[PDB]
Structure 1
Amino acid sequence: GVHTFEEESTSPVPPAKLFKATVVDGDELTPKLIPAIQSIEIVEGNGGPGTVKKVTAVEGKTSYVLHKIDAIDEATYTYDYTISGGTGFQEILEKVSFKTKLEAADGGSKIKVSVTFHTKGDAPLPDEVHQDVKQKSQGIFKAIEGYVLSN
């Protein structure tokens, strides 16, 4: 099954600053801010498209998922990535593809996302899986946003 969700939100942080923290410095900041995330390790690449990362978390059980950069562009505040594989990843998911873009709005940012869940089999995406992936996505982003506001 393919399950696509599009949403907009806002931040009081302007986009160059918010993009730098969430995307350019996201690999170093995320484990500093989210206690459960132990490490973000680059498996392949340079931080450009095609870069593969291993994200390790404690959910006392340690597990991991893999991220791939699909697109990244500082001038357009664009970051598209796919989460797939690993011991930490929901059994029912093949992958989740994220497309994220910021734009300047009202001294802060507008945030535009598209999230595509790919499930095994032909059943609806379970509400619990949608809720869990949205809560993790929001939690990381909002923890980084709070850190920027506190600096």
Structure 2
Amino acid sequence: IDPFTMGVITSESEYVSSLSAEKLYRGIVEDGNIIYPKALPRFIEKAETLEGDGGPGTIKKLTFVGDFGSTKQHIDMVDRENCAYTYSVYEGIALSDQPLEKIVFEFKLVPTPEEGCIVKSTTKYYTKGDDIELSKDYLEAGIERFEGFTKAVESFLLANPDYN
């Protein structure tokens, strides 16, 4: 009687990039503050880090083009060595007026013998126990926006190898 309930919905998607794991990781994680407005110019107006040096515990902020507000990313795991990166979002337009406690975004790049890499995207949606009602359309739009974000940075680096 009167139990504790919580749901975790996990979505996974992969694709094969020709870009090396190190270069893609570097563009997304280390140089994202510079890359994002140039790689996603119709979405990201500005990318900055509010607190921290980039390691676990860092808070970055993407401010959107026009009048769409902003989103704060809470960096959780950072692993340059294995091209693994993880962060959480607790509020924002990523949540899209659904009953969510948080969203975790996970990203892992695996080298391929051709010096490409496999891009592994994961989203985890955390829901309280009164309302476990998430649209199958909504769930896959989130992973699709996230993986598409990666593809846009991949597109940018492929076209601009020498962006300093």
**TM-score when normalising by structure 2:** 0.80
Residue identity opposite 1:70 in structure 2:
D
Of 48, 54, 75, which aligns to 2:55?
A: 48
Of 11, 23, 35, which aligns to 1:29?
A: 35
Q: What do you get for the CA RMSD once the two structures are aligned?
A: 1.9
Of 137, 140, 148, which aligns to 2:149?
A: 140
Q: Which runs of 4+ in 1 moved over 3 A?
A: 86-89
For 1:95 and 1:79, how far apart are their aligned partners in 2?
17
For 1:79 and 1:108, how far apart are their aligned partners in 2?
18
Further displaced range: 139-148 or 82-91: 82-91
Q: For residue 112 of structure 1, report the CA deviation from its aligned partner.
A: 2.3
Further displaced range: 93-102 or 46-55: 93-102
Q: Map 1:86-105; keep pairs closer than 5 Å.
A: 86=92, 89-92=95-98, 93-105=100-112
For 2:32 and 2:38, how far apart are their aligned partners in 1?
10
Kindly provide the CA deviation profile for residues 73-118 of structure 1, in whole angstroms up to 9, marking residues without a partner as x. 1111111111221366422132211222112113200122332111
Structure 2 equivalent of residue 63 of structure 1: 69
Q: Secondary structure at the match of 1:62?
A: coil
Of 65, 81, 84, which aligns to 1:78?
A: 84
For 2:73 and 2:135, how far apart are their aligned partners in 1?
22
Task: Report if aligned partners of 2:32, 2:47 keep a CA contact under 8 Å in 1.
Answer: no
Unaligned runs of 5+ in 1: none
Cα 1:87–1:117 change in 2 (3 A) is: closer
**Greater strand share, structure number:** 1
Task: Report if aligned partners of 1:63, 1:88 keep a CA contact under 8 Å in 2.
Answer: no
Matched pairs, number: 150
For 1:88 and 1:79, how far apart are their aligned partners in 2?
18
Which structure would you say has the larger Rg?
A: 2
